[PDB]
């Protein structure tokens, strides 16, 4: 009950005024002269309430620095976080949470900060609140969830995000996605798009891009034959295990790596560019300083939490894939060859393809790994032509593979619904 402040004072009243009017210097003076940082009026309102809703970041920081109660609750049950979320002050929301604000504080009617942010469609604030553990299924006095309020106010991008986030929470999964316009590259929808995820076999389209770049440059040939032995075979090599007598061409290996996710095919192609280090160099040299490959198949699928080896972010992967499929990084022929291999993907039936509406185009590459890891990168769109890039990753769940497949499919259905 110590969050219900109810003490008045002369200096406290003058501080309450300076907090509303945004008098940064007057606040510092009153605080230096001993004003009560938790002074309260007849509504239980403190200076931190006033600074939070008025959007004065500097005053909020100073007040917290002098011991302001981050979880002060006024007579209506509002905390400073309620007000910061309602008035759309992102940086203040972050500062309050960094200083220990209750992310799931409830007012008299059961409204939480996530309810208020969802009502206004503040995407960035919604994501911050979720990142700090906001309850996505919180119901107010009338049984309304944050999604219900977003849906009622036409905030469909936030509505989509909240439904994806709730499904992931149910599974115990960390999920990220991004959708990019193929032609312009504009970010259309996103969630956790700057967090790292294990690439798994989705790296194979980047590998193919690096091979196609060397083919464009005359340093590699589609028809060049690579020989290998039974001892070189690693697990899940359905095509390469059948060509031990005379090997396979570069083109055949790239087709097997993409359409069948053949692991030995990917390792053989990695060798031609100097291994994982060589693929990472190719990525750096086209402007991707985030995506990195460090290990070979099958070790790169280990998916250790907080391990940056063999990871990308949704936005890095989507931006790089767009550069490979559009624009001048690859020739028109190589561009189209990469898209054609991805269109011929044979081993991604249970994912986006399972929810693809009739007449739509999809070219994709899936990945699977340990620690409940699953992902997909795709170019898709209506009318038999791709118009957007979608990248989706999930990891950390104890879910079955069927549940992981369904989660990816569900996210894809959500994005297709909100197209």
Q: How far is 89 from 79, CA to CA, in rounded Å?
A: 14
Q: How far apart are CA 388 and CA 177, in angstroms?
A: 13
324, 334 Cβ separation under 8 angstroms: no
Quick check: helix, strand or coil at residue 284? helix
What class, spelled out in words, does domain 1-154 have in CATH?
mainly alpha
With residue 204 as reference, give the H or E element that holds it: helix 203-216
Catalytic residue among 201, 213, 261, 397: 201
Distance CA 14, CA 5 (A): 17
Dihedral sign, Cα of residue 396, residue 401, residue 405, residue 411? negative
| Of 64, 65, 19, residue with least CA distance to 45 | 19
Considering the candidates 58, 194, 241, 299, report the single residue annotated as catalytic. 299
| DSSP structure class, residue 287 | T
CATH fold of 155-419 reads Beta-lactamase (3.40.710)
Nearest in space to 202 (alpha carbons), one of 396, 398, 395, 388: 395
In 244-360, the DSSP E strands lie at 248-249, 311-312
Task: Read off the tokens for 114.
Answer: 């996530």
Structure tokens, 253 = 């290996």
Q: In the 8-state DSSP scheme, what is residue 220?
A: S
Q: Which of 143, 57, 139 is nearest to 92 (CA)?
A: 57
The distance of Cα 165 from the centroid of its chain, to the nearest Å, equals 11
In the residue annotation, 370 being an active-site residue is answered as no
CA distances from 397 to 72, 174, 188, 407 (A): 36, 7, 27, 11
- 175 CB-side CA count, 13 A: 30
Task: Tell me which residue of 88, 86, 26 sits closest to 62, measured CA to CA.
Answer: 26
CA distance 309 to 331: 30
What distance, in Å, lies between the first and last C-alpha atoms of the chain? 47
Domain ranges of the chain: 1-154, 155-419
Peptide bond into 202 cis (omega under 30): no
On the CB side of 269, CA atoms within 13 Å amount to: 36
Instruction: Report the 3 state secondary structure along 372-383.
Output: CEEEEEEEEECC
How far is 381 from 261, CA to CA, in rounded Å? 23
Experimental method: X-ray
Residues 6+ apart with CB under 8 A from 307: none
* Phi, then psi, of 39 in degrees rounded to 5: -55, 150
Q: Please give the Cα distance from 355 to 409 (Å, whole number).
A: 6
What DSSP designation does 356 have? Answer: P
Residue with tokens 């940056």: 308
Query: For the residues of 53-117, what is the DSSP string, one character each?
Result: HHT-HHHHHHHHHTT--TT---TT---HHHHHHHTT-HHHHHHHHHTT--TT---TT---HHHHH
Query: One fold for both 1-154 and 155-419?
Result: no
**How far apart are the C-alpha atoms of 189 and 121, rounded to whole Å?**
13
Residues β-bridged to residue 388: 181, 380
List of residues 6+ apart from 418 with CB closer than 8 A: 156, 157, 159, 160, 189
Structure tokens at 323: 């550069």
Whether 299 sits among the annotated catalytic residues: the reply is: yes
Resolution value (Å, 1 decimal): 1.9
Q: Are 140 and 115 in contact, with CB atoms under 8 Å apart?
A: yes
CA distance 332 to 334: 6
Tokens, residue 266:
């990917």
User: The tokens of 227 are what?
Assistant: 């020989």
Q: What are the two backbone dihedrals, phi and then psi, of residue 333, each rounded to the nearest 5 degrees?
A: -65, -45
d(CA 358, CA 384): 9
User: Could you give the CA distance from residue 353 to residue 412 in angstroms, rounded to a whole number?
Assistant: 9
Q: Which helix (H) or strand (E) holds 389?
A: strand 388-395
Angle between helices 57-65 and 90-98 (to 10 degrees): 10
Q: What angle do CA 392, 210, 265 make, to 5 degrees?
A: 80
């Amino acid at each position: 009950s110590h969050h219900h402040h109810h003490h008045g004072s002369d200096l406290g009243r003058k501080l309450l005024e300076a907090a509303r009017a945004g008098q940064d210097d007057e606040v510092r003076i009153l605080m230096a002269n001993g004003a009560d940082v938790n002074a309260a009026d007849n509504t239980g309102t403190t200076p931190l309430h006033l600074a939070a809703y008025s959007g004065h970041l500097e005053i909020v920081e100073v007040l917290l620095k002098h011991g302001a109660d981050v979880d002060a609750s006024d007579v209506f049950g509002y905390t400073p976080l309620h007000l910061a979320a309602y008035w759309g002050h992102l940086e203040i929301v972050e500062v309050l949470l960094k200083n220990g604000a209750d992310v799931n504080a409830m007012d008299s009617d059961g409204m939480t900060p996530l309810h208020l942010a969802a009502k206004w469609g503040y995407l960035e604030i919604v994501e911050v609140l979720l990142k700090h553990g906001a309850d996505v299924n919180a119901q107010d006095k009338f049984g309304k969830t944050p999604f219900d309020l977003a849906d009622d106010n036409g905030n469909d991008d936030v509505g989509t995000l909240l439904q994806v986030a709730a499904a992931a929470d149910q599974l115990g999964a960390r999920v990220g996605y991004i959708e990019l316009d193929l032609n312009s590259g504009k970010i259309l929808e996103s969630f956790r798009s700057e967090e790292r995820f294990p690439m798994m076999s989705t790296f194979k389209v980047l590998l193919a891009g690096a091979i196609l770049s060397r083919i464009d440059a005359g340093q590699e040939q589609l028809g060049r034959r690579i020989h290998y032995s039974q001892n070189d075979l690693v697990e899940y090599s359905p095509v390469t295990e059948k060509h031990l007598t005379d090997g396979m061409t570069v083109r055949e290996l790239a087709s097997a790596a993409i359409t069948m996710s053949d692991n030995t095919a990917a390792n053989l192609l990695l060798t031609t560019i100097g291994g994982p280090k060589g693929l990472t160099a190719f990525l750096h040299n086209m402007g991707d300083h985030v995506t990195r490959l460090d290990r070979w198949e099958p070790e790169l699928n280990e998916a250790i939490p907080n391990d940056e080896r063999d990871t990308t972010t949704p936005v890095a992967m989507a931006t790089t894939l767009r550069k490979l499929l559009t624009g001048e990084l690859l020739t028109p022929a190589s561009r189209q060859q990469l898209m054609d291999w991805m269109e011929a993907d044979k081993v991604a039936g249970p994912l986006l393809r399972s929810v693809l509406p009739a007449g739509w185009f999809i070219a994709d590459k899936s990945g699977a790994g340990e620690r409940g890891s699953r992902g997909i990168v795709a170019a898709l769109g209506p009318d038999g032509k791709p118009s957007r890039i979608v990248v989706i990753y999930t990891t950390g769940s104890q879910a079955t593979m069927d549940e992981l497949n369904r989660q990816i499919a569900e996210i894809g259905a959500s994005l297709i619904k909100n197209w």
